[PDB]
Coordinates of C-alpha atoms and ligand atoms in Angstrom, one line a residue:
Chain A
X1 CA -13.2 27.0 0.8
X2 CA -13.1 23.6 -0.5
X3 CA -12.4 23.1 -4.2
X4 CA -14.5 20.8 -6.7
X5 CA -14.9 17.2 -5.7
X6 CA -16.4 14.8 -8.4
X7 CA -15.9 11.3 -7.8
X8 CA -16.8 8.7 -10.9
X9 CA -17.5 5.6 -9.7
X10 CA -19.9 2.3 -9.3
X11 CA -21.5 0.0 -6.9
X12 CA -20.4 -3.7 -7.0
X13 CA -16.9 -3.0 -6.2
X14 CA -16.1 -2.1 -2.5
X15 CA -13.5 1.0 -3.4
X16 CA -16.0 3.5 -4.6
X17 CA -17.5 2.8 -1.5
X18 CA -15.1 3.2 0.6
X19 CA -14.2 6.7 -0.7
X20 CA -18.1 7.4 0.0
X21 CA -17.7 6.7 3.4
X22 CA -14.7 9.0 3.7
X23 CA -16.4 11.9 1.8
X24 CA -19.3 11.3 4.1
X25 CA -17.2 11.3 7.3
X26 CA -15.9 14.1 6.5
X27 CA -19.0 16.0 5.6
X28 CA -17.4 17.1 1.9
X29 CA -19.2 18.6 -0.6
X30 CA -19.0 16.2 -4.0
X31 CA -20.8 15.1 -7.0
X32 CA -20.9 11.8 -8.3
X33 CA -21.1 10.6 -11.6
X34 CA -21.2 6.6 -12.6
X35 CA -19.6 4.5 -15.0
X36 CA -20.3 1.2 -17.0
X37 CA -18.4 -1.2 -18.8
X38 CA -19.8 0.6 -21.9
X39 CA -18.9 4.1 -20.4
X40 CA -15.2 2.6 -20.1
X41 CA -15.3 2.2 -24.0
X42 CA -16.7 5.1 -25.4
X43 CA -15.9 7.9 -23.1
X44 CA -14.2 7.1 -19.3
X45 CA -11.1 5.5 -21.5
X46 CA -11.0 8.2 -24.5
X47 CA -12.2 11.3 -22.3
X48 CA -11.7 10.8 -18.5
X49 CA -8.7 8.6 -17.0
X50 CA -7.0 6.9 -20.5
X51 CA -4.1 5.2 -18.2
X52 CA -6.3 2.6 -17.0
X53 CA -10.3 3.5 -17.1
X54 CA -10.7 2.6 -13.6
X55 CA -12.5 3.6 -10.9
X56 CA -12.8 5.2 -8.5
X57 CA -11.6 8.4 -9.6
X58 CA -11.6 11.6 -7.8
X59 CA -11.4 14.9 -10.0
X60 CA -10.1 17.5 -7.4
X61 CA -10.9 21.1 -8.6
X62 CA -11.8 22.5 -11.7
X63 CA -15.3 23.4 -13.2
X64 CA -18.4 21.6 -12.7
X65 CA -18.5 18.1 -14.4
X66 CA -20.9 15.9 -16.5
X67 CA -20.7 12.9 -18.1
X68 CA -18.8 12.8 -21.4
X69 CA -16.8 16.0 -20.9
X70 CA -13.1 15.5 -20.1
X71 CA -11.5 17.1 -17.3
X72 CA -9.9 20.2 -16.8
X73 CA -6.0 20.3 -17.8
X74 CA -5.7 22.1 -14.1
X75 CA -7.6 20.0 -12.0
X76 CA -6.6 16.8 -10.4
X77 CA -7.3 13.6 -11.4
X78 CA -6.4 11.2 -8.3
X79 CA -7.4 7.5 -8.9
X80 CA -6.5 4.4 -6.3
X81 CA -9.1 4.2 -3.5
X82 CA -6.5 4.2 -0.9
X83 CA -4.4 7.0 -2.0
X84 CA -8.0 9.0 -2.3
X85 CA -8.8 8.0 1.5
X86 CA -5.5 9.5 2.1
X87 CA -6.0 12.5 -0.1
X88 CA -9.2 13.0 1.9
X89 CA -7.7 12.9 5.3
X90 CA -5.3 15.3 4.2
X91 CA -7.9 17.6 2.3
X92 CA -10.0 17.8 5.6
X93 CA -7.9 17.5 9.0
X94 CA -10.3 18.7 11.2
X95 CA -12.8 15.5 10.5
X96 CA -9.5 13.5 12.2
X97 CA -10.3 10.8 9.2
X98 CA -7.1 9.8 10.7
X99 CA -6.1 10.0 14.3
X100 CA -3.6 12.9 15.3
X101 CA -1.3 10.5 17.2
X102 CA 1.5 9.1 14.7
X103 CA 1.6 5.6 16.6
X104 CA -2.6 5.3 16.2
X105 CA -1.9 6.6 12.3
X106 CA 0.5 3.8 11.5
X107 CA -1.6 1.1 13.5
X108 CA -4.7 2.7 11.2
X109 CA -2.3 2.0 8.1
X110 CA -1.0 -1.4 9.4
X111 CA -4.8 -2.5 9.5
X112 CA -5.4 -1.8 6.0
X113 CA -2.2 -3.5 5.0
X114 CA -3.3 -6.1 6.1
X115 CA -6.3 -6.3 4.9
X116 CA -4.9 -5.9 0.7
X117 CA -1.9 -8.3 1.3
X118 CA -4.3 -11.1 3.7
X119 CA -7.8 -10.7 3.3
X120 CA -8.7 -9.9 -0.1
X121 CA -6.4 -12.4 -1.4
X122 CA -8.3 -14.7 0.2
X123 CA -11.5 -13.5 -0.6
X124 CA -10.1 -13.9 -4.1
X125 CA -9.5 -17.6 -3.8
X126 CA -12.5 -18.3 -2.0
X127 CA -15.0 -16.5 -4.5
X128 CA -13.5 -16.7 -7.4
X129 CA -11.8 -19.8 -7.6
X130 CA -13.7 -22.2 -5.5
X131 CA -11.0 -22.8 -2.5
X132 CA -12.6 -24.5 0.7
X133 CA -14.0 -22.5 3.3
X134 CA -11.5 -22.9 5.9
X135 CA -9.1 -20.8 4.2
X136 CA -11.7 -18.0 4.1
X137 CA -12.6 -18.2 7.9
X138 CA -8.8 -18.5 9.4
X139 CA -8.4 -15.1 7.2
X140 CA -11.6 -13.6 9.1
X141 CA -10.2 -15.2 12.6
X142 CA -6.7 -12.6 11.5
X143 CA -8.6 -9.7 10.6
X144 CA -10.6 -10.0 13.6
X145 CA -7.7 -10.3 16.1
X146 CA -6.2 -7.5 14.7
X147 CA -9.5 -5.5 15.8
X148 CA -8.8 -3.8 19.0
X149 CA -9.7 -6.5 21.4
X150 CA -10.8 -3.8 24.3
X151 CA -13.6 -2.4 21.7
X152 CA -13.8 0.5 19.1
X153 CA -13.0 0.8 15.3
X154 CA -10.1 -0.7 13.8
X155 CA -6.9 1.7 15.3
X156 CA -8.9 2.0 18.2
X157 CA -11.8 4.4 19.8
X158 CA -12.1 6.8 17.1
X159 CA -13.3 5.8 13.3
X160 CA -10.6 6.1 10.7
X161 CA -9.9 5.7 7.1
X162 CA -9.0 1.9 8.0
X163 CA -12.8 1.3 8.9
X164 CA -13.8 2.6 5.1
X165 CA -11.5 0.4 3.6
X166 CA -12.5 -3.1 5.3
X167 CA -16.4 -2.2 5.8
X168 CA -16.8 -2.2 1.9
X169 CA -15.3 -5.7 1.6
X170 CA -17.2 -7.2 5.0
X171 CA -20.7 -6.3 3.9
X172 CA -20.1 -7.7 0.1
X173 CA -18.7 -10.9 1.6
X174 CA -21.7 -11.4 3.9
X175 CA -23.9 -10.7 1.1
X176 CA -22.2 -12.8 -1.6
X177 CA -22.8 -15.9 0.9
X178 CA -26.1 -15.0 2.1
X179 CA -26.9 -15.1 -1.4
X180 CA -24.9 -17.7 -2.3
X181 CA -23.3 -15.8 -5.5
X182 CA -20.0 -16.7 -6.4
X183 CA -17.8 -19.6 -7.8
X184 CA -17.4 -21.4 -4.4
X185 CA -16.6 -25.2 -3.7
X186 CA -19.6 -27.2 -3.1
X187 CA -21.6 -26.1 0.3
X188 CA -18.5 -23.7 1.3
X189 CA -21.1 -20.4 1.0
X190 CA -23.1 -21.8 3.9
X191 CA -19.7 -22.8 6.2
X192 CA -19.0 -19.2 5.9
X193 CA -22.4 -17.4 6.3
X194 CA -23.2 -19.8 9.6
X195 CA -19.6 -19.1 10.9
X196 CA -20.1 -15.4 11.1
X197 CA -23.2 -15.9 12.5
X198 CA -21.6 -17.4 15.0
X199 CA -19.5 -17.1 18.6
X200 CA -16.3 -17.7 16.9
X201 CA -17.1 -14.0 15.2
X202 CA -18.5 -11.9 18.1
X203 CA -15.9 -9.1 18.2
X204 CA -16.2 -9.0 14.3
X205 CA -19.7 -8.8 14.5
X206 CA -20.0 -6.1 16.8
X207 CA -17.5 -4.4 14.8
X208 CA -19.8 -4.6 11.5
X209 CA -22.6 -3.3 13.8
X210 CA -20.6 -0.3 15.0
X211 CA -20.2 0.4 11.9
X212 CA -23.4 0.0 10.8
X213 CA -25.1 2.4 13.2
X214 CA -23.4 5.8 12.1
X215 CA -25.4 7.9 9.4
X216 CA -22.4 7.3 6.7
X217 CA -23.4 3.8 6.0
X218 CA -27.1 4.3 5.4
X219 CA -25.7 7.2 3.2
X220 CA -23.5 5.2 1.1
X221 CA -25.4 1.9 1.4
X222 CA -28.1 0.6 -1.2
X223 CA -28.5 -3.2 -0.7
X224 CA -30.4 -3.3 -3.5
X225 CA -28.6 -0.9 -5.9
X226 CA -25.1 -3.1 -4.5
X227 CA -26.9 -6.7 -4.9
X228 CA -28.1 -5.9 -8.7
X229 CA -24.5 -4.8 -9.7
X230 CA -22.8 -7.7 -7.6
X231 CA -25.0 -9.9 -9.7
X232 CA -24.3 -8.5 -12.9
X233 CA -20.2 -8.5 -12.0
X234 CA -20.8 -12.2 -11.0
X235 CA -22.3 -13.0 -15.2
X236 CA -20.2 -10.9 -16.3
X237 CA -17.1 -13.0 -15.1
X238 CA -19.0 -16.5 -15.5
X239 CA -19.6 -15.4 -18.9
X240 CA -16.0 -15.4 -20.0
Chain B
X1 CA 13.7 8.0 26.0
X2 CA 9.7 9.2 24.7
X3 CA 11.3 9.5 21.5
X4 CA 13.9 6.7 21.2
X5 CA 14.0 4.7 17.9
X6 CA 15.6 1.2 17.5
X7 CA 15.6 -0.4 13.7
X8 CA 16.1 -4.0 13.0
X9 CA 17.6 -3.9 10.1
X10 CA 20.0 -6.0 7.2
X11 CA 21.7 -4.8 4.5
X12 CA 20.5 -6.8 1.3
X13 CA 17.2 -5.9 1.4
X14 CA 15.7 -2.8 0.2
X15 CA 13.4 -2.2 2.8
X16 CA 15.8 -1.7 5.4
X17 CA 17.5 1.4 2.9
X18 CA 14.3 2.9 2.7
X19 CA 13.7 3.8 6.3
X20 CA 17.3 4.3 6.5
X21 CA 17.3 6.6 4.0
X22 CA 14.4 8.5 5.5
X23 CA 15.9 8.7 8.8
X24 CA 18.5 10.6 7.8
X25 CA 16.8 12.8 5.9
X26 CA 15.1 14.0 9.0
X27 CA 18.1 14.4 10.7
X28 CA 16.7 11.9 13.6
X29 CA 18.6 10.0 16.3
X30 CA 18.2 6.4 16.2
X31 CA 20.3 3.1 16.7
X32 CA 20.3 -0.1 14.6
X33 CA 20.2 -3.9 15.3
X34 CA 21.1 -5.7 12.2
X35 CA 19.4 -9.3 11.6
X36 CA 21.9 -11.3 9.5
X37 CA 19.5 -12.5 6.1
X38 CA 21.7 -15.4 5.8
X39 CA 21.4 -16.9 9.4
X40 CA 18.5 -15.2 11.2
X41 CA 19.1 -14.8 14.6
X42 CA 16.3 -17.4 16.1
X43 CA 16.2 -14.8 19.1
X44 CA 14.9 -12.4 16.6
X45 CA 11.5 -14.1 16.0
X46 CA 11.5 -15.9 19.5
X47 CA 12.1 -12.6 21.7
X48 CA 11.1 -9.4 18.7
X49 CA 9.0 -10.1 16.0
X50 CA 7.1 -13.3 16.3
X51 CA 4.9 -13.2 14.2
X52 CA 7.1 -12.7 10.5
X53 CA 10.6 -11.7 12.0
X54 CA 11.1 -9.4 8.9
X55 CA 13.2 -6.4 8.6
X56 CA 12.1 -3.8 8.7
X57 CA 11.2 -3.6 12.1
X58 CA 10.8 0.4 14.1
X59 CA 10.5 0.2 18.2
X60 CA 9.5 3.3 19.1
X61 CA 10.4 4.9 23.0
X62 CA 11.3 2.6 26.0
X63 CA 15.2 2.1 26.9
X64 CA 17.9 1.5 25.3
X65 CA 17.8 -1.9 23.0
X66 CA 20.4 -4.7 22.8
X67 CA 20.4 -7.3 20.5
X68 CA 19.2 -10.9 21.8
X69 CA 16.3 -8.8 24.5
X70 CA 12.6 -8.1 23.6
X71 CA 11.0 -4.8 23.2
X72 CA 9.4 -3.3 26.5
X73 CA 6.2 -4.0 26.1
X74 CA 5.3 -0.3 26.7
X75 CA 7.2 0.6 23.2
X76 CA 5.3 0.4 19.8
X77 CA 6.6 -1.9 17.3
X78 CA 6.3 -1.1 13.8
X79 CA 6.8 -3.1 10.6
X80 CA 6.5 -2.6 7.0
X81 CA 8.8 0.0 5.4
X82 CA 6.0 1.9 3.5
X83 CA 4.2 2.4 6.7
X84 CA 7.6 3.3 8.6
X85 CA 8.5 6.1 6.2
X86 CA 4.9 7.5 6.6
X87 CA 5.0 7.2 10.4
X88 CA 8.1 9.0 10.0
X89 CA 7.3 11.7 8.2
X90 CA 4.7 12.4 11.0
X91 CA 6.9 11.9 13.5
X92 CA 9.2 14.5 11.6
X93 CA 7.1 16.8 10.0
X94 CA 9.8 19.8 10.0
X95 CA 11.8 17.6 7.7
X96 CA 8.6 17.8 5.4
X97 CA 9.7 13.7 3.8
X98 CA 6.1 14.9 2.1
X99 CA 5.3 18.0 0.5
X100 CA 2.0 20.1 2.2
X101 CA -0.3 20.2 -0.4
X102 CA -2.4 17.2 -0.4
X103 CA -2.2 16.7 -4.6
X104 CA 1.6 16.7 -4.0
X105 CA 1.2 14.4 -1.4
X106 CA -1.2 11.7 -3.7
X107 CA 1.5 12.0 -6.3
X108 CA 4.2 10.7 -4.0
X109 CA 1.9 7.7 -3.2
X110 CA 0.7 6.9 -6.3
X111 CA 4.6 7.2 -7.5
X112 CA 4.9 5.0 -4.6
X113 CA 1.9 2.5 -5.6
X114 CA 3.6 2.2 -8.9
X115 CA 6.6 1.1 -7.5
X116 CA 4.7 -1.6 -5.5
X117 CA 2.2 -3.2 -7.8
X118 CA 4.6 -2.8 -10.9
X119 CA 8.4 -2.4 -10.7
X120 CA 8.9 -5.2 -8.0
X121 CA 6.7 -7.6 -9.7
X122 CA 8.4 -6.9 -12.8
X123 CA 12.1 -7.0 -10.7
X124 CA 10.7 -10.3 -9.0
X125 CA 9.7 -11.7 -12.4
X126 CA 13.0 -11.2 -13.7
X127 CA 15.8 -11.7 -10.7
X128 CA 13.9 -14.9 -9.1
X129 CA 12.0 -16.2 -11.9
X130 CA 14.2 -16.0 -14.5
X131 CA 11.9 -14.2 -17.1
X132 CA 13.2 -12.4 -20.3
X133 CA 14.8 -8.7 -19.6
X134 CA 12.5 -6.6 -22.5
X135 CA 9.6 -7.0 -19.9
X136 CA 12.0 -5.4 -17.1
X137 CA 13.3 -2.7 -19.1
X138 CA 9.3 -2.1 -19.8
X139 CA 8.8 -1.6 -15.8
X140 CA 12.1 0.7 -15.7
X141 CA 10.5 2.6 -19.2
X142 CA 7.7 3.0 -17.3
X143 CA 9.1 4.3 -14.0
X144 CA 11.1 6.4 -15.8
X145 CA 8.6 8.3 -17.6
X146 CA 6.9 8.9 -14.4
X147 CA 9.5 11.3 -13.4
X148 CA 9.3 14.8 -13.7
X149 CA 11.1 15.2 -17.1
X150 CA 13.2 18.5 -16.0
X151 CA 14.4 17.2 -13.3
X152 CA 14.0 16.6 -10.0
X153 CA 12.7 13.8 -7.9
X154 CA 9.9 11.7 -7.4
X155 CA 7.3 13.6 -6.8
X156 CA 8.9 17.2 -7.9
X157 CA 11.6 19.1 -7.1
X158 CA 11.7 18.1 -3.1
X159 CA 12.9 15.0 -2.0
X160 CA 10.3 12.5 -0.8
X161 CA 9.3 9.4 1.1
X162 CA 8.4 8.4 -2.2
X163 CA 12.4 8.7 -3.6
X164 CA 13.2 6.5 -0.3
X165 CA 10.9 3.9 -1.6
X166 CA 12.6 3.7 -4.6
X167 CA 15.9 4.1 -4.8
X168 CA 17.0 0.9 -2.3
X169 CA 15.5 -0.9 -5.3
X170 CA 17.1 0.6 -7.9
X171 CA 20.9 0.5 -6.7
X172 CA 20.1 -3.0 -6.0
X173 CA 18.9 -4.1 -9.4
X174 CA 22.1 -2.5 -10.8
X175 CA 24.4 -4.3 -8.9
X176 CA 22.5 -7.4 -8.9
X177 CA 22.5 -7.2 -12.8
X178 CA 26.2 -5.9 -12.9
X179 CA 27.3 -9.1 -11.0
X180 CA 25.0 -11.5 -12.5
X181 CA 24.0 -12.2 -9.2
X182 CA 20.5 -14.0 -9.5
X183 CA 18.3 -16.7 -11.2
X184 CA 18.7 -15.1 -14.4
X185 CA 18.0 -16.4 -18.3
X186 CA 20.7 -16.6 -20.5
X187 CA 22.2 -13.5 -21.4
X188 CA 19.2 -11.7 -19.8
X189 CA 21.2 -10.0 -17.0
X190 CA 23.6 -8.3 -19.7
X191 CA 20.8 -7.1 -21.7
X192 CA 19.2 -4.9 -18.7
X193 CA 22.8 -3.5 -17.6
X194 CA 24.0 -2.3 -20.6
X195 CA 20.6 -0.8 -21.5
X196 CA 20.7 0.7 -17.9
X197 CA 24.4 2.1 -19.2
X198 CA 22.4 3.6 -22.7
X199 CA 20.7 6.9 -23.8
X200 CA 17.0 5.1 -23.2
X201 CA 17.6 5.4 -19.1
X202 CA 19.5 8.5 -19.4
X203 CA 16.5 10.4 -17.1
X204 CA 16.6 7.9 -14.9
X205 CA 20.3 7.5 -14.4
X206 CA 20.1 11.3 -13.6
X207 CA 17.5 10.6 -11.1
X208 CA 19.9 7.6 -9.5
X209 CA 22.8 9.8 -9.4
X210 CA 20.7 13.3 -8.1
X211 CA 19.9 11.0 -5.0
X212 CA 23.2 9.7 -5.0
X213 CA 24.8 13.1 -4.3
X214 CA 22.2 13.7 -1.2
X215 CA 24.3 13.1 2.7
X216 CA 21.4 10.5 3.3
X217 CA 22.9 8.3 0.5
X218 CA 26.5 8.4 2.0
X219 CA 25.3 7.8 5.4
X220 CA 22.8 4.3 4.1
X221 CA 24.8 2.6 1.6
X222 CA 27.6 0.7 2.3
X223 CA 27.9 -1.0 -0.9
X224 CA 30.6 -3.7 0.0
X225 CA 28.4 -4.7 3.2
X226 CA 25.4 -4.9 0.8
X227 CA 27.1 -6.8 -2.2
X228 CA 28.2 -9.5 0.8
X229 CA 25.3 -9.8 1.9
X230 CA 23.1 -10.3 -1.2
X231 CA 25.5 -12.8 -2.6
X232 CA 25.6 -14.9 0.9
X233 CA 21.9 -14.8 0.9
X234 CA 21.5 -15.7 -2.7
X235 CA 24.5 -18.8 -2.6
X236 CA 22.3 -19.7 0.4
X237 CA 19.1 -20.0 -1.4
X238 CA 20.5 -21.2 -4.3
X239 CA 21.6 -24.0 -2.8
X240 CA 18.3 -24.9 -1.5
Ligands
CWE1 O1 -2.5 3.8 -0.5 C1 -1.5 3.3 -0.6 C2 -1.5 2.0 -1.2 C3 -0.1 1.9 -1.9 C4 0.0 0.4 -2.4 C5 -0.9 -0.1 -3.4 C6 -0.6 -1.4 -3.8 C7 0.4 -2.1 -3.3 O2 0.7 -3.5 -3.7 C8 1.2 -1.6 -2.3 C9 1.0 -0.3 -1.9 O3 1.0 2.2 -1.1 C10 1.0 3.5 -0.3 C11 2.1 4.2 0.2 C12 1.9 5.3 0.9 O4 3.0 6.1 1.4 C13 0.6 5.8 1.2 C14 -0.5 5.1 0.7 O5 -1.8 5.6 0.9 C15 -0.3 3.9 0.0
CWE2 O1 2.2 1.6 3.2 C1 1.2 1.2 2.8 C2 1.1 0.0 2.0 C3 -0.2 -0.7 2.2 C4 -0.5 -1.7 1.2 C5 0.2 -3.0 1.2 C6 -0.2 -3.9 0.2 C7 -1.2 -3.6 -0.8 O2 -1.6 -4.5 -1.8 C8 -1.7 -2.4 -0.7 C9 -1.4 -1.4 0.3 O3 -1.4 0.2 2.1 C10 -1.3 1.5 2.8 C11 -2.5 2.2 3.1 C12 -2.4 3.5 3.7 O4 -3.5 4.2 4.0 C13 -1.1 4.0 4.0 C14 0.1 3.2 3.8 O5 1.3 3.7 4.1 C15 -0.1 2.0 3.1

């Protein structure tokens, strides 16, 4: 059987997402249960995960949860997105979340590497603190040679845990420059959205499409549910 | 030959130790190629790793490896320590460098996460940038408590990939502190050893010396060969 999976999480951010898309992959059986800024206050920090009220947050086992009840002394509480993708390969081996040959494994862990130490820095300086669009686009040009040149998903034929953690972070980026939300240098938004548009982004293209297509995207996907809270993250930060 | 491993390796860094270290807990057969951290080898990046000629670096099968030739290209090349130890412990998975259950297995990482996003920070803070030692002791603190209080390792009573993530860096910040060898503040080196020496890191100095004891240490750390290089590498870049 498969114990109790209850994931607290939210939209804007890529990670809850990405542990959708692994949950989905491997057809699991979960609940989920959000969390706001105000939730953080009066009840996620007091009742849920005190450490650091983040999410996402998987609760592994125990009883049925709702919001404002603590968990369980004996379940698990397992936060970091990552470690939860790997927790979920583990939890169900025969969805291969991960391929079964330990060379295709570590190239499925070198691509998401690379993608924390590369391409969300520089996602960072680009949308949050204005840096020219260049930057942006020679990070993109890395992440896409690092795509399997002959085809496939990111350590190859097979999907992996490596696709949910970069698909999150491509679809907010296109979005956040089709829409033009962020704190970028003047006209950089449009450099961006027409360069991925473009030849110069084919293979990466046809990688978000491959994507795309399989049922756990349009299962874990609300544009509009994703745009609202992106928005709201983006005042939220301008604010202050 | 299917199964051949060649490590570049040095002897300052940590990262190195920590694939060393899991090596010989799986009782595997592999030979080494040391990269001097002083005076890289230029046939290192030209010929090896061209695109960050770090150390780290795991061929796996092909012949056997000399210094100053390239891989075959038929051999997989793989960097980063973190993702070496868990393509070893799939490689090896009789040695069991993770426990089975997959909550003992998140635990190990998240140790491991901790280890990345705040104990070298804080060690980086302090040994490079020359910042005051309460804020290092606060990291160690931390770590420490993080332990299993009985005792034990890392992630229980088993030895883990998640010990041979952390234990390079700890012998290293004790000698480094115990020779003053860094860009330390006044008196601030002091301050961390002898606290290190006290009742506050008495857990942790058990946790040090438990992994101490273990043949893998024996077989890893050659602390005179370390000590030389660290201090060569640090004169060097000092004087820079
Ligand atoms: O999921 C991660 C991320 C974590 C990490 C997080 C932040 C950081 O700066 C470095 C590493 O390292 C790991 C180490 C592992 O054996 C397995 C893992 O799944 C991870
Ligand atoms: O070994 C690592 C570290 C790498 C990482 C590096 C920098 C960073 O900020 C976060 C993670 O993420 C991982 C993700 C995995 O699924 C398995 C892994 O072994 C790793």
């Amino acid at each position: 059987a498969q114990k109790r999976i209850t994931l607290y999480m939210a939209s804007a951010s890529p990670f809850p997402h990405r542990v959708r898309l692994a949950l989905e992959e491997a057809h699991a059986t979960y609940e989920m249960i959000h969390i706001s800024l105000v939730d953080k206050q009066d009840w996620y920090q007091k009742k849920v995960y005190p450490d650091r009220a983040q999410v996402p947050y998987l609760i592994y086992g125990g009883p049925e949860l709702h919001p404002d009840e603590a968990p369980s002394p004996d379940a698990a509480k397992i936060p970091e997105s990552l470690v939860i993708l790997e927790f979920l390969a583990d939890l169900f081996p025969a969805a291969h979340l991960l391929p079964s040959d330990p060379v295709l494994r570590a190239r499925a862990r070198l691509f998401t590497t690379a993608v924390e130490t590369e391409l969300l820095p520089a996602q960072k300086a680009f949308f949050l603190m204005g840096g020219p669009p260049d930057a942006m686009l020679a990070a993109l040009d890395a992440l896409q040679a690092r795509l399997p040149p002959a085809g496939g998903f990111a350590a190859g034929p097979q999907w992996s845990i490596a696709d949910a953690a970069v698909m999150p972070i491509l679809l907010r980026l296109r979005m956040s420059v089709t829409l033009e939300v962020g704190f970028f240098a003047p006209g950089a938004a449009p450099v961006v959205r027409a360069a991925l548009e473009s030849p110069r982004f084919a293979r990466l293209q046809r990688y978000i499409a491959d994507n795309v297509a399989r049922p756990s995207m349009a299962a874990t996907w609300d544009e509009a549910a994703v745009k609202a809270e992106f928005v709201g993250r983006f005042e939220k930060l301008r604010s202050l």
